[PDB]
């Protein structure tokens, strides 16, 4: 799909992914939704090949809750996106390599903070305040990279986040229908549904 | 070299006359009588093998020449202009008529055609 | 193709087969490869068939023009004018031309003018697709200042072997013979070099 | 991208008893997509009428072009061309952009007006003659249209039969082709009547 | 896949009223070099069937090594292998088309084109075509490569349909194909002069003639041809 | 297609068959592929059919002039040479793939000709699709010294091999005889061994059986006095 | 690069009646432009009221009926001799066709019978095996050439009842074995005249409640 | 190819047209799009024909096991997604399938999946696909409403094929209608174009543009 | 450039056209006029490869033009269509042709009779009710061809506009910016400047 | 490369260059190509040196294992096992080789082994890049029952002819001899034959 952003704040990690699902010469969807609950304080959002996308996120998924289940524990959100990492690693090797990039919002509920990891499909890891994939990064970085702080607040990071997708929106040439908006914190996972 | 003469060698005198024109007329008049007679079934075209020397063989000197199938031609006048006149006749007919249409000209229209080639040569450089 | 044309004691004789091919089929198997370009200055052609023949007919024309003028050409003359039309349209043409003439002053006289529009006077040549199987016949073979009978022995023998492997050659073998005496045109019929 | 298959249509020409019949769809599209469904296909020039398939732009040009010459023909000749005639202006001027041709698929058609025979020809985009004594067809559906016409077609039909034999030939071609239909045009040409009918059918 | 290195030219046959008459020249060319003059290509299987190969060489001698093969086990445990359970030429064909298929089918074909010429146990004239591709058919004239283009025309003169058999004598039939040989020899660049041809009789059963030659050759004429257009000497 | 020229006696024949085809599908089933040069110059064409037509028409027409120029019956040799310098020129682009013959001054000519300029001198020649099968008719059964009436038979025999085995001939045979001192005498459809069968039925609609929408005069007249 | 497919040519034609079901094709086989045989049957009676054929490439077409007629054949080993219907017929050549449907059989097949009720049967199948039972297909070289001309004179496509004028479509009355086999002779007579890969002979298998019927007819060999 | 589905107060509506083309040869105006895999579910075609055909009633194989196995109807979430995940097993290979899976079930209520060849599964309220797909959004979106009487809507489905098989080139023949409810799919006729065009122009006032 | 439309009424031709012009990535303007004025009562709008586009209908106005000032008359629509055509069917047989695609829009005052003319780069012309180029057309034929009616005024065609536009909003990828309409009739040519 | 092998009256005799090349350049002027696979039976090898050799060795392994088990091979045996290596596995390989051998029995006998695979068993052969210069010269000049004196000849001047017109031949003529005497290798360097 196209458009996945993050942002780490002072408490919370918040996600946003667009809406449109676009076949070629249509737009057959526009309230898709492009993420998964990983763990109950961790979210992955997720945008690349048709297909892949969805069967690469359903199979982490399908992991990390096996794990949760075995251990009765929740893995941290560093623990999750290696072991996310290392699927990509593995998979751009393959036969058919997993075309999927995926950001990774978690609370870790021992460290008490936000973490927000973006990985690409070859399996590139960076841990980061802010994140994106695609050409998202190219309208969005330059707004991040000077209102930024990390003693914000959920909802500087919310208005900061509209400032980015109003960007886009401007500046973009395709229509991506908006943005579902999800917030991560100690609480766990929650939608936005007003953005 | 070059044909520097790119200016018309025929013009208009005081009186309105075209002196070249009337001149090549004057040449026609001293050329030798041919005529032609129309029928209800038939046309015949005339003249006279005025011969320039008995030892000359007039028979390969043709007078009378055959433009298409169904069209002839004679003169009067200066037998040189007149073959040269034939061969672009002979030519034109082919390049802007039959070519074309699969057929050959109707008389008025090679006809015209003979004209416009005579009509250049008096007014061209 | 398979041609060839050897100098001796009394002139030149030009040799070749009459097999020309579209792939495998045998579009003409009684060609005559042997063309005149003057009185007694022949060549034998190989390579496109189109160019070969477009090229011999402008030479033709050239000799001819040139005769008019300034008398009976002389071989090389003839070789020249092939190369400067072989070499200056070198891009689209594939042509291989064997020049063979016989003058008084110079007598039998052999030149070669190869794919590129070089010239190459030699004692014998040999081109077309047969003539890689007779390099090394011919060369044992050859001797210079050989009567007309050894001379029309040698090219028989040479392109029956020719004729015998390259499936690109073949039908009869035709000879045209220049000497002071005149043109002679000889052939020889598969049943007669076969059996060699 | 095949020029002679980007807007589709179909034209077919027969031969009756003192009578021709001439015929096109009336579609224009763009590939899949339907543009036009008034796109006529048949012109006439005096009495000569002209059928022309394939691109569209061609087919306008040429129309334009064969109404300049047959203007300055009559204006010239004193008297309208005839179709034997006008077959060898269409071949001449095909010909003549050999190696940058026009992408059409003309039908000739007429009686002549002197010998009073029935005439019809075709031709392929570079000026080729098909003169054919039964029918001629030509466009996206030339196939379907040789099936049609090789079963269909008696030769001496009458007008008003050869009518429904040429129609029915066209209807039934266009139905087997996505390219074609969108409406229909018949021309019935006697020595000195020409009837035109638009025909019903099917819209998809 | 692969592309054919030693290759040999047509096999043409027909049917006649008690038979079936086949033929093939005795090259293996080397693209336009013609490598080797020896090369049988007519492969008698038993005393009713031949099978004629044309194409890849190479490949000619391992299917010449199958049906070699092929009469060997047949005579396993099989006290009737010289009658009743002999081997047919519809049976030597079928094992043949079938193997066509399979090779073709792993993208690995046997590079010829085959005909199975013979008689069957009922005097029946068996006459089927299989090549490279698996694709087979039959007629009352079968040929191969150039023979398929001019070797066919001439001898459908001679059977032009099933009816036309009965009326054919091996006289005129053999007479047919040795004619066709001769205009193949003419205008196959890939031919030799040297051929086999053998004959399948219900009566007189199996005649295989080797080292014919083609004959009674027209050249001639080409003497009076000069130049190729204006030329005259 | 399938074209032939057979030299015989006191002339030559060329013959043809009379199906054009575009790819698998027969355009015309009766096409006339036996050309004039001059009239008693003709040839025979094939490949590209526009192209045997145009290139026999101009070199036809500029053959038409020569003959008026010099006041000489055209030569065979003549069309050959304008022929293949115009082909050359074009690098085999004008797909014209002809056999030519006639009678002149000279005596009978038979050459063929190939898109990219290239001639041929023979007593018999084919050209087309069908010239394999013509071929192995021809190399069969000439011999020199054919008469008029053999050559005839054999140059028609030469086109039924290729109308009957050669999917790309077809219908009917058209032949041309040249002979010296004599007018050119064009056979047209010669043989015609290919008459389609009656039909099992008959496919004359009832009248009314097609929908009209509207119903109009065409004006073909100019526009009328008064 | 060697490929593994070639195009035989010719044209088959399957028609369904009220009762019964024919199965035409034409008797050529084709490679380029020559013809390798005038008659090589097309058309095969593959048991159990059941006629078959798999037109284009011959090698698929042969290797499909045979692999067909052995199914046929361990149907009634498996399943107590039971009838094979046209239906059960048409599901099982869809996963013959399939099972290569990375590597396909390069052909159209036609398959015609009774259904179980005794009415005619007429199946169609794609290169890949999407199939489906019609009234009236044609198959292979000429197929475009016949396919209209069947819509106008089977169904009665375009064709309105005179004095109406488009308003009442003329009715869709039944014909009989005689009638279809005239409209399957001109269609290959008229494709023979048009097609250059049509012709030499036209061989007919009828399909009733009393079996299979055959007749074969001449065609054009130019 | 014209096929839509699309979700409303009485269940779903299934329309699609009936023609098949080979480049511009027509080669069947009889095509049927819908694949009856069940009773109560309903497949549509589009891509490929024998992908579409066959992989949809080996899905009714599946679903039948499914049913024998848990003793309960398969959900239409469950249907779908055995199909998806088998199309996926194949991505690369050259499959060609875009299809509406319909069903009504108790748990779920009206239930459409767009399942898609190179392994896309979106359940949605509207879907339209083939070559004429975006004719017939056209008069979906303008004319949808949850609200809609099953007449109503059958007439919509119906209208929309009709709208793409007009412009579109490669879609046509004749419309088939379908209405799946809870206790199955009923089948709602077939319905030539050529006389429907007519038909709903003199009734509709629509198509102004053409000459009838 | 993207979108363009239009639709002949009773009295009028109304054309819309979009107003984003889009280099690749970024969308570089959101008010661009696709369209020129060639004569007092003809518009022409545009669409097609950059540079071109507007290189050409300048040459088209300034022709027109100068027969406007030379025979001091206005030409009709259909002539102005016609001189249009003949330039794009020569262009399209050029070394590099003109990759242009037009409506042309004109209230011929001797007839009194609005007419809508669709003229494609090959030099394809159509005299229509309706039109588009591109993928236009795709999405709002089917709506034209419901309610499209032959005597409907400037207000009801100016509704039907914006039921294509709405749609064309929904279903297509690309963010086109909304549209400029205008309207050409009998008193000459305006602009509608809230749509 | 240019390589033979000649029956003669009291055996076979096999020939060959000595030239390797990397495109123009000689890699090794002093190769020896004529391979011992077992006691009396060689082989000459050309096409790629890697493959020929891979060959080579394999087929001296099954006539080492061969007459362990069942004592000495014959020369058809051998042919046998290059042909099977070639033939089926035709596709990875790049081999033309001669094989020649002398048993007591069936005394000379050479058969050839081109790129397809095929086998031929004839009098005498050639191959390599250069032997199409000679299948005139060859065709012409072999005799069958020579003596060792005039086979060595034969191949002598052959090669000669072989190595003066192929740029991929040269070096010195290596010549092994098989007989019922035993195995005799010659050299013959460019002074000798050159002059020929
Ligand atoms: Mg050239
Ligand atoms: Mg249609
Ligand atoms: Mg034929
Ligand atoms: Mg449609
Ligand atoms: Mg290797
Ligand atoms: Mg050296």
Known sequence: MDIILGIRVQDSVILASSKAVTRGISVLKDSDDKTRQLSPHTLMSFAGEAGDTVQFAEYIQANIQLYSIREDYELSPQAVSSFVRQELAKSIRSRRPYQVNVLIGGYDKKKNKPELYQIDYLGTKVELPYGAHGYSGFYTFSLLDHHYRPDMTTEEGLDLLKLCVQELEKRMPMDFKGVIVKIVDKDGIRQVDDF | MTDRYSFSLTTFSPSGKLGQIDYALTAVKQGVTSLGIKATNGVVIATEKKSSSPLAMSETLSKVSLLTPDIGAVYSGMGPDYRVLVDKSRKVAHTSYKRIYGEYPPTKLLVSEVAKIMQEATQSG | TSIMAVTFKDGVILGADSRTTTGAYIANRVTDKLTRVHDKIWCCRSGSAADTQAIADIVQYHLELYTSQYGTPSTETAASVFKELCYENKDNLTAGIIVAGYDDKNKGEVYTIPLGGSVHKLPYAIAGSGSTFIYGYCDKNFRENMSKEETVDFIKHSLSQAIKWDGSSGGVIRMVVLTAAGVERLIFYPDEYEQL | ?????????????????????????????????????????????????????????????????????????????????????????????????????????????????????????????????????????????????????????????????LFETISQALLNAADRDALSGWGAVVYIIKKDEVVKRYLKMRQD | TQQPIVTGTSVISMKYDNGVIIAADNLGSYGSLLRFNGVERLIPVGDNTVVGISGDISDMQHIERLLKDLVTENAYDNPLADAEEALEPSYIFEYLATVMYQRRSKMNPLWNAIIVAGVQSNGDQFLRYVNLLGVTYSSPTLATGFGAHMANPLLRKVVDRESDIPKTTVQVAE?????????????????????????????????????????????????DIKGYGTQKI | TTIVGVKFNNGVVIAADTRSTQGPIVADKNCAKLHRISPKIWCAGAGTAADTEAVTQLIGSNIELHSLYTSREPRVVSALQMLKQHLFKYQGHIGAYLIVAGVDPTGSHLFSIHAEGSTDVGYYLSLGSGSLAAMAVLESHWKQDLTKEEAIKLASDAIQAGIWNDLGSGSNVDVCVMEIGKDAEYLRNYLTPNVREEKQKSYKFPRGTTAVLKESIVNICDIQEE | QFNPYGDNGGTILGIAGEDFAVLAGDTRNITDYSINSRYEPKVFDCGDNIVMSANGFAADGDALVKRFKNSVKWYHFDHNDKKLSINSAARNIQHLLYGKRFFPYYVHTIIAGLDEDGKGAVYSFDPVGSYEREQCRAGGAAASLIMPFLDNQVNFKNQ????????????????????????????????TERHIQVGDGLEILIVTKDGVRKEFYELKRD | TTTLAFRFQGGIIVAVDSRATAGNWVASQTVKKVIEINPFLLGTMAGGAADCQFWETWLGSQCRLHELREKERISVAAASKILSNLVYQYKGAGLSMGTMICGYTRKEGPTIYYVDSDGTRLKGDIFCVGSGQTFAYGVLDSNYKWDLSVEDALYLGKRSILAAAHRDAYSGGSVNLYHVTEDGWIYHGNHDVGELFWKVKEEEGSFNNVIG
Chains 1, 9 share one sequence.
Request: some cysteine; charged content about 25%; proline content about 4%.
């Open chain 4, 1 to 161: 991208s095949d020029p002679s298959s980007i807007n589709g249509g179909i034209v077919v020409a027969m031969t009756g008893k003192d009578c021709v019949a001439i015929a096109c769809d009336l579609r224009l599209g763009s590939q899949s997509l339907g543009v036009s469904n008034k796109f006529e296909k048949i012109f006439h020039y005096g009495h000569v009428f002209l059928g022309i398939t394939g691109l569209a732009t061609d087919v306008t040009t040429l129309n334009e072009m064969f109404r300049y010459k047959t203007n300055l023909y009559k204006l010239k000749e004193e008297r309208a061309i005839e179709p034997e005639t006008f077959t060898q202006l269409v071949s001449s001027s095909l010909y003549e952009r050999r190696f940058g041709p026009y992408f059409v698929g003309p039908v000739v058609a007429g009686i002549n007006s002197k010998s009073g025979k029935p005439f019809i020809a075709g031709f392929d985009l570079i000026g080729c003659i098909d003169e054919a004594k039964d029918f001629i067809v030509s466009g996206t559906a030339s196939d379907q249209l040789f099936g049609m016409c090789e079963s269909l077609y008696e030769p001496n039909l009458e007008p008003e039969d």
């Open chain 5, 175 to 223: 007479e047919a194909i040795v004619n066709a040989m001769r205009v193949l020899y003419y205008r196959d660049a890939r031919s030799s002069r040297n051929f086999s041809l053998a004959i399948i009789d219900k009566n007189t059963g199996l005649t295989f003639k080797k080292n014919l030659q083609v004959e009674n050759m027209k050249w001639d004429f080409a003497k």
């Open chain 7, 160 to 191: 309105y009842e005179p004095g109406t004028n488009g308003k009442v479509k003329k009715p869709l009355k039944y014909l009989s074995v005689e009638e279809v086999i005239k409209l399957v002779r001109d269609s290959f007579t008229s494709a």
